[PDB]
Symmetry: none
Subunit: 293 residues, 4 copies
């Protein structure tokens, strides 16, 4: 009754059927990633674009291990993706299958896989510095787009950036298609397993996920990136001591390969006051103005 | 679920809005409900540091529960999220530290539009002004829609009038009592404005963007009626609901141009996806303008 | 050769034919305004919008008194109008007739005529203050639109604002359809007859027409408006003394009916430094923030 | 004619761009023409007040006429009008008072793209990078088009390379001599880059938005050729022009993916209105990306 202005979230809202696509026009292939309850699969879609009779795509789907909770999560993801719109630097929705079977969410296939692996298998023969400047600019633009659509990414990290042609990087939601009890980057806090080393303190202590929370993670991502795929706070486990250190204001030092301008952005992203952190729009404009330096 | 849309009521309070409450004076109550009220006030140095202006302040009565404190704070965070527009009542500032929460918004000197239409029903202000009211309220809703917001009580009684012939959509939440207003009627758990609500909202309790358009149609009807009451004479009971489901509708207001009536009708399509969107309603009007 | 970045003006560019409309579907009626070389005519257009079989429109056309120079001016106007786009607060292009006869430019008809006349025939029974606030806001929005499309109006003045339904005002180009040797508001300077009392000094002395030049005229328009249709610098002829006065920095005083906020805008519009003048976007935002005062 | 579009070269010089020339040092010449040059330079306190950066400064030689002073000042006012974008060389500041006009823009450390392609023609940098170059240059042109600007000399030789794998469209006006470059050839009054010009530009001297797209096609051809010369072997004479009118075209570069070739072909449509716009070319590529 009170407060007549109610924000409507695209999750709670009709599924637009312009996305629906015949499940008899998909051929599933090798799995690309799986969690306990879901998986992303490589596939061929026939007649998805009138120019490409057969294009490789990725399909997100649940495993028969999955309950009602998961089935709704996948539909929410589909709905969310359906409202975002397209941008070069995210993985885009191509279509879905809801009628006549389990829900299938069809998105872009990114042939070069994810950025962390790429960075690590390349740590030796060091792809060079300019590619790394390019990736951080592109990820910034992609976060700026998500933020202009009022959207937050609650797991920004090199392991969720994918690589495709034209040297393009794309931000990705891996939800459900990743097993986190097996990954030490995810650690128990409260009920959940979270990526706390990528998380802003206000997110860890006060459970607040703002737009500036993402900017912190972007900072950890830059460190991740210029370290060529190393872990954040390398060697140190997440525990009482860590939380205390983050709270007191201790920060990581510059990676050996970060130019001075980037570490500079890193540091401001990690300001304890969220309000002193740059926005993604500012990061993008900063990288563009300083590109010749 | 990595991707998540931010809810405005979850964001932290932005201190850019903070305003010293020793710069406020209170005057007469504009509206009161069970748990809160809206008071006329003076704020010094609010826009210009030189100057003083009249504003409206919304606040809780001493008998407010945590649910009402949350409602008032949510009202504030939504307003802050929306930003400014000429056709809503805007947030001007808040007092949060040093006492009860105060939400400062625009004062609208001419009062609400329903009362204005009734007191003007005698002389007939002309049809050109009712056109402007239509256009402005649609512009205001198109704007709320664009920020992904819905209004739960769009009705001439929640539309305010200010200078420059400007009309503003307003959230009267918490500052109206309804237990004695025939327009609000018990259904299920709550008291609701049923004559203004779309059928799918009454039944399945679906509040969406197309629900508002329905209410816009009922508004257009109030408007070109000069503030007569909707579905006049009919009480709300089983008879009423059953009839609305079976396609029952109001006929054209005596003073509506046929086109505006056609928009009303399209607003009342039983099928939510056949109703116009506000953006479309704006664009219609912006051509029904030269003809 | 030098300078490879060349701005292309919509005047010099192909006429898009999506505007072309059959001249056998127009019936000309009474003239609304004429110059020596052209005129605007009231007309009926059959089948212009599928909803209105017969709507009144305005048609701009040359008189047989007109030379090649004028014929090109009218086509330039048509081209300009064709690129602007629509906005509620200007008079919009509806179509043209180029093939099989003289050029005809079809625009919106505004039933209540122009604002200056309206203001003057209403000076006695004083339509009230709130309508005047509304007109200045609407004209500001219309200038803001023109400026966002990089367009300037070189004759902004109450005599070029038209009135239509819904209490809507619309900015208008009267070019060619007005005789200026008969109107004392237009006065000789150099070769041309110009509206110098509406013109910014940098426009008068240095022949520079910027976006802030328009803002000056907007200021004179507000004065014109809150004086209920009086002439600017009433009684004083344009001559050496006037130019000197404008140059030294003398300004008009507030009209008897201008609220303090408006005269305030007036004054800043008339700053001798163009750079200290508000932009139309700022004027609009100022009027909106202060609307409750 | 009351409505008039502002030409950027007519606007007054904006002093927000002014920069003290005692904060500049000059180094080596990057490029020189008959009447002017572009020099490598250091500017202190240009972006950060703390710091120094390398920039490029464009200026007139002592033998420049009023037409060249105007060209240089027009270059400056156009750049100021366009504003920033990642894919053009941007204006950083100007020195106008206290001596000759100096136009400060971005230094691009890797030099021009034509030379880069040739020196890389040996090893084969891969096809993924040529895709990025295509996309970036189209993004840059789409941007110039959106500000209603045309480029009179779009060619790999006027595309510069900087950090982050970024390519930037550049105006080399005044800082190249052409009297000895076979790529510029006398036609009528001027020396022109004819192999890059659309047919309607050579004849009726029509320079429009669709003329640029033609040149973009020739660029795509240079690009996937690794900087071979266009219409290789053929000199420009009556033979040449007559053939271009009668539909003569280049065939696919040995290393072009078929789709990119299809865009080249559509860029070379004799009918200006059949050619894609840059906005369309961007959007194509942004899907030819996952396949
Ligand atoms: N081999 C690889 O490493 C690899 C490849 C070639 N693709 C992926 C993953 C995805 C892809 O291509 N689209 C997606 C959309 C959503 C999502 F959650 C994952 C993916 C991997 C891990
Ligand atoms: N009738 C009158 O006298 C009257 C007048 C002159 N103002 C109001 C109300 C409000 C106003 O001005 N701003 C608001 C902001 C919020 C809100 F809930 C109510 C108001 C009334 C009822
Ligand atoms: N009677 C009146 O005063 C009157 C009326 C009813 N219309 C006009 C003029 C125009 C109109 O309606 N559209 C235009 C479009 C262009 C233009 F240059 C003039 C007009 C007048 C002077
Ligand atoms: N080859 C090289 O060595 C080379 C390098 C490293 N830079 C340039 C040129 C320019 C630059 O960097 N900015 C400009 C801005 C304007 C302009 F006309 C030329 C340049 C060259 C030719």
């Amino acid at each position: 009754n009170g407060n007549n202005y109610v924000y409507i979230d695209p999750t709670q809202l009709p599924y637009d059927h312009k996305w629906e696509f015949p499940r008899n026009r998909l051929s599933f292939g090798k799995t690309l990633g799986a969690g306990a309850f879901g998986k992303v699969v490589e596939a061929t879609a026939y007649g998805l674009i009138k120019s490409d009779a057969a294009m490789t795509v990725a399909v997100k789907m649940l495993k028969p291990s999955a309950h009602l909770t998961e089935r709704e999560a996948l539909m929410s993801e589909l709905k969310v993706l359906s409202y975002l719109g397209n941008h070069m630097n995210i993985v885009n929705l191509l279509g879905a299958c809801t009628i006549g079977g389990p829900t299938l969410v069809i998105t872009e296939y990114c042939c070069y896989g994810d950025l962390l692996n790429f960075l690590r298998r390349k740590r030796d023969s060091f792809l060079d510095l300019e590619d790394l400047l390019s990736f951080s600019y592109q990820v910034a633009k992609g976060m700026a787009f998500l933020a202009s659509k009022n959207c937050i990414h609650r797991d920004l990290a090199a392991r969720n950036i994918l690589l495709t042609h034209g040297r393009i990087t794309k931000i990705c939601d891996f939800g459900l298609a990743r097993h986190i009890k097996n990954d030490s980057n995810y650690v128990v806090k409260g009920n959940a397993r979270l990526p706390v080393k990528w998380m802003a303190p206000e997110s860890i202590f006060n459970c607040v996920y703002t737009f500036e929370s993402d900017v912190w993670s972007y900072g950890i991502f830059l460190w991740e990136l210029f370290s060529l795929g190393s872990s954040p706070y390398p060697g140190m486990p997440v525990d009482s001591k860590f939380y205390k250190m983050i709270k007191e204001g201790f920060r990581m030092l510059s990676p050996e390969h970060a130019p001075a301008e980037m570490y500079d952005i890193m540091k401001t992203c990690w300001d304890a006051d969220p309000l002193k952190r740059p926005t993604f729009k500012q990061i993008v404009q900063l990288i563009e103005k300083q590109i010749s330096e």
